Here is the input.
Amino acid sequence: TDANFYVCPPPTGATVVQFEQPRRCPTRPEGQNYTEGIAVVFKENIAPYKFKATMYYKDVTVSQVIFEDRAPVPFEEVIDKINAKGVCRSTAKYVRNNLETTAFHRDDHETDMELKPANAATRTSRGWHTTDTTVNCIVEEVDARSVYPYDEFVLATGDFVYMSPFYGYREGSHTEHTSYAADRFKQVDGFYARDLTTKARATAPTTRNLLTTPKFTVAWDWVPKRPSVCTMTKWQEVDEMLRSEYGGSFRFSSDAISTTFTTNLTEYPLSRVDLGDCIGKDARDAMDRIFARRYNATHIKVGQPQYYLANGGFLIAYQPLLSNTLAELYVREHLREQSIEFARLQFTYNHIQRPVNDMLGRVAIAWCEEQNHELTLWNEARKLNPNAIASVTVGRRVSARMLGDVMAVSTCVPVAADNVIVQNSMRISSRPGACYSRPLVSFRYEDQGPLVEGQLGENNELRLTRDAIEPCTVGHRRYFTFGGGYVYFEEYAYSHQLSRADITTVSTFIDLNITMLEDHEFVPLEVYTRHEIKDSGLLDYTEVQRRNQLHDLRFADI
Amino acid sequence: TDANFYVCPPPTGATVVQFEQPRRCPTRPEGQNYTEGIAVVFKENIAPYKFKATMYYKDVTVSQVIFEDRAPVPFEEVIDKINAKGVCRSTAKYVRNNLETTAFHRDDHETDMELKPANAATRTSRGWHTTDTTVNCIVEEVDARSVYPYDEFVLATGDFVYMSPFYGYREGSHTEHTSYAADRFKQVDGFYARDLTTKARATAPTTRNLLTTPKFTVAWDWVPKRPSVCTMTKWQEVDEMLRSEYGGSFRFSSDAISTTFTTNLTEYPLSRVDLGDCIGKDARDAMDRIFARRYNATHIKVGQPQYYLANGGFLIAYQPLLSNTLAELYVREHLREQSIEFARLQFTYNHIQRPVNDMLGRVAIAWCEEQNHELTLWNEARKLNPNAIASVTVGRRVSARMLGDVMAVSTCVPVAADNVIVQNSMRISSRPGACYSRPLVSFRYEDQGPLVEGQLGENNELRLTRDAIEPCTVGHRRYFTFGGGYVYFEEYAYSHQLSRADITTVSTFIDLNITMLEDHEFVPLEVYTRHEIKDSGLLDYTEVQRRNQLHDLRFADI
Amino acid sequence: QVQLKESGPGLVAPSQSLSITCTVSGFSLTTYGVTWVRQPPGKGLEWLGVIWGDGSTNYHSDLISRLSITKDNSKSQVFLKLSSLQADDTATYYCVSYYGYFDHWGQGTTLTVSS
Ligand SMILES: *[C@@H]1O[C@H](CO)[C@@H](O[C@@H]2O[C@H](CO)[C@@H](O[C@@H]3O[C@H](CO)[C@@H](O)[C@H](O)[C@@H]3O)[C@H](O)[C@H]2NC(C)=O)[C@H](O)[C@H]1NC(C)=O
Ligand SMILES: *[C@@H]1O[C@H](CO)[C@@H](O[C@@H]2O[C@H](CO)[C@@H](O[C@@H]3O[C@H](CO)[C@@H](O)[C@H](O)[C@@H]3O)[C@H](O)[C@H]2NC(C)=O)[C@H](O)[C@H]1NC(C)=O
Ligand SMILES: *[C@@H]1O[C@H](CO)[C@@H](O[C@@H]2O[C@H](CO)[C@@H](O)[C@H](O)[C@H]2NC(C)=O)[C@H](O)[C@H]1NC(C)=O
Ligand SMILES: *[C@@H]1O[C@H](CO)[C@@H](O[C@@H]2O[C@H](CO)[C@@H](O)[C@H](O)[C@H]2NC(C)=O)[C@H](O)[C@H]1NC(C)=O
Ligand SMILES: *[C@@H]1O[C@H](CO)[C@@H](O)[C@H](O)[C@H]1NC(C)=O
Ligand SMILES: *[C@@H]1O[C@H](CO)[C@@H](O)[C@H](O)[C@H]1NC(C)=O
Ligand SMILES: *[C@@H]1O[C@H](CO)[C@@H](O)[C@H](O)[C@H]1NC(C)=O
Ligand SMILES: *[C@@H]1O[C@H](CO)[C@@H](O)[C@H](O)[C@H]1NC(C)=O
Here is the structure.
């Protein structure tokens, strides 16, 4: 078998995911009225609306070697030159030194030229341009997303558009939010699209919107707003959650959520809203399902469920429970007082509540300490390799990088293994003494498509930039992941390919049956007579920490 | 809500915490006489004695551009010039080329000058100096600590003082340890303090001690030695601990301690010491509390508790236990032999001890393997970020760094969020092409206090040195933690501030509902026409590992 | 030179709370502590407690449940408190400073518990 390759692009920042941090676990339990039970937490339905938008812009530069900037394209040029004929006007207008100025392509004359598809781009992010003073016209199709407020929508490039995607004039959408002058927007009725790759023209009309931002022109199809779905969505069904009362506020804790919620001790009147049919129905249905799964044989329900609004925008549904052993103590004590109703009886017998408070207290503290141990370790690995940590946290291969203290994320494009080829050598002939640290690769996004140049990354990743170069060494030997198996390289030359099952695996935590042997270092004689560094494998943490120390010494020498 | 900021100073080494390492877990169980039970381990009461001490010293240098060194200040100058008037003598004495030498401030004349408070310092580490040949007088108030032996006390600067803090002549303290000549120490009766910040003079006397070390003069108030407290203290109450006999020595193991103790198979005669009332009382009280918490319903106590001295200075109290199922086997077998007393009966029936030895053997081995897995991962993260690992291990924000193979630790000073301001720009105008990697900040240690300059660190940390500079890039976008929320910066310019709840959170381990999109890289045209590097976020582990490779190539080119 | 003087009610009823204040001069209470000692009629001395320069305090095992000591550094006075007084509490209370170990002692106040 062979795994699919991935060409992960660099995220621009359209999607930023903050990540949780450690907490202050109490040294000794202090919460009152401890109790276990089932819970279902609901998150605010952000209602993400995704759509594709076309971006237009031009580039202008001076041939003397200066003054390079970007500017948008007017509306008439997009709907007449580009839409009707797929061509861009040669002349371009811009502001230079706070003064109106113009330019032309090679200063030839006022003419028109057709647009051509981008050389590499992506199959899902098609783009076009007029050329691979100088003027260039560029048109690109990118994705866009909007949230419940629908006041702004972010493009795939990371730039926000302060305007509602549903704004228009066809269906009285003038009331929609907008932050641009009336002269900066235009809507066309009966508009027909034209795929520049084929120029076959659209088959049916689609009203098109057009906006001109200070840096580019954006256009998207105006679609009526869909009916609003339920305002809340099930975030996660908690199998077990402990509730504690302290400081006039409840405290909910779990082992899987890794977060503590706080409420005002008053049940939110869910009945006040007619959405109970969406939340009350889904919530109650989950309580019985979880209860029948494991609590039907050992626990008993205590009254009807409860709903509370927690800090951060979460709605927590609750169903307090108590073990059969604790139930025996309550009924036994109740019989003494008599000389069946668990509600309005729990927390009454202080002597019976004293041991359970301490018992459940250790469980809550244990989860908090364990979660802090995992959170601090997870956060460190996240900074060390956001690609692997981001991919596992979402269940699919994903690209990500840290934009300071927040992590930007984007999706990766997969490519089949039969569409990639690896070069036979990793040495660069342009300059001796330097060679690529990883094998070079050439591939195509799809079968029969154009070939592109790139470099092999980690975990079948395909890098579009060939920059992983390093001073070369003697006795080189490395294994690189390539599809299902591995590709072996020695002395910066392709040797052969081997499968995944041809190498010893240590899947288990501890394996003492490794038939290892005392390796004897064998260095070529050129290391002594020519003083050329010998191979040392990838840099260990101390090696990189020690390697930069030498750089400081070299700088001091200089 | 907003979290308090922290200005963590660099630890000097007064407090060094070594940290545990992996162990050699047995591949198969080999211990004999396995048994479970409750345990309470006691550590030697080090009895840390903390106090504040004042340090005095002078600096002398030559104006020609040489010979810069430090020297202490005599006793008469401290008690007459500094204590009575808060001034330092202009002239200073020192040894140059193994010869007596003197100096003066600007070579003017023999005069006196007053001391002024330190420009930044800390509210809890107040310091003073005469000036912000050249001579400068400095006086500082730092913390000191001493351990049970009371033979030496370490100052906050990390320098040890080989002398007992209780040494003196008032109450016959001549027998206290000391390693300095009699002429290097002086004690003053009826001494009056004077806070240099106010010069209000003390209200009541306090006998003061004075010592002159080779580098500085130290003075502290002589306080009589407090009565000695119990010699041992409860280190941790073990909820479950397994005891095994092997190689003529017991072996105690637990799941929370992560350390194995070894004893000589002989109970330490705790009754031999009268401290049993402190250890025997506290120990026995913990045995019943732990037993009544979870072992009263499933286990039975086997005889009276036991005490053993383990390697490393630990005293382990024990209470062997056995499950009810195992109890049935013993009583059932005892009845056969009869053709109630669990003591002197356990380990007798070999056929009954054979399965329990193997059963508990897996538990002990399982804990050892799991602990090694966590220890090796924890130790690696410790080297990667001692500040976060040190803070969670103690429960409070703390500063720390690795002094080779040992970690030095110190406490951090908190500052309110309303006392810090962030600059609107992070670009430095002194030299184009370079700019700070994090926003600059200005704050004050307390309300109405003087303002200080610094840089914003990680996790609301405030750095007193502005040195985090980097080659600048195009399309810059970063989020930095600032108080409760985040501060957004783009193109090295302050954009706006946002709250903590305005970013998607992935608190749970796996979240598949991330509404991400395929980001399309948007680079300014100057990257091509001006060849200026584009932003790439923080450096991934491979990037830093790949970035230094280029440096090696650049050095080779040079 | 150091001196200490006690001030109390002299006579109190049983089961009430006692309050005695010891005024001291000659040393700063911020650095040195003060110890309390009592002596019933015809018996030896008995240690009650102590308050060091810091806010920490130590009390006898037989009086920890009822004994309590506080102070004020500005006034150089140490307040002694004792709740649930019994009949045998009748004794002469003294306040002994730590400028030394037990160098200076106060004159002492004779207290009697009776209705
Ligand atoms: C739990 O209860 C507290 C206290 O009642 C709630 O905080 C309160 O929240 C209300 C809004 O729901 C705040 O009122 C608003 O405050 C400011 C002026 O302070 C202004 O914007 C508005 O005119 C309005 O009055 C109120 O100030 C605030 N009180 C406090 C003491 O913070 C809290 O929201 C409740 N939490 C949950 C999760 O239900
Ligand atoms: C467990 O038992 C062993 C063996 O008895 C203990 O080791 C012994 O410890 C004593 C001191 O307690 C050592 O005696 C001293 O040794 C040297 C000369 O070797 C010298 O400094 C003194 O004159 C004195 O004799 C003794 O040598 C040492 N024996 C061995 C074989 O190492 C051990 O301390 C016990 N462990 C525990 C935790 O109780
Ligand atoms: C724990 O729960 C009990 C039972 O609800 C609380 O005790 C009651 O408190 C209310 C006021 O909140 C009183 O009117 C009742 O008389 C109390 N007793 C009973 C039997 O209901 C108790 O306050 C809760 N504990 C905390 C710390 O809030
Ligand atoms: C396990 O414990 C048993 C019981 O104490 C030990 O067996 C006794 O050993 C002593 C000498 O240490 C003998 O005098 C007894 O006759 C033995 N039997 C009994 C029933 O007490 C046994 O030695 C221990 N195992 C190991 C490996 O030390
Ligand atoms: C709970 O268990 C009882 C006893 O077996 C059974 O009758 C009942 O149907 C169960 N209920 C659910 C909801 O599983
Ligand atoms: C090899 O594996 C066997 C089990 O298959 C194990 O018993 C043995 O100890 C192992 N040998 C080594 C040298 O680790
Ligand atoms: C142990 O449990 C028994 C049976 O319920 C009970 O009588 C006894 O008081 C319990 N002892 C302790 C110390 O909790
Ligand atoms: C979104 O969350 C729901 C539960 O609220 C889950 O069933 C669904 O699979 C999630 N969708 C995706 C695309 O991950």
About this structure: The radius of gyration of chain C is 13 Å. The interface with chain B takes residues 25-29, 31-32, 52-53, 58, 76, 98-101, 103 of chain C (CB under 8 Å). The beta strands of chain C are 3-7, 11-12, 18-25, 34-39, 46-51, 57-59, 67-72, 77-82, 91-97, 109-113. Residues A 32-33, 245, 347-348 surround ligand 3 (CB under 6 Å).
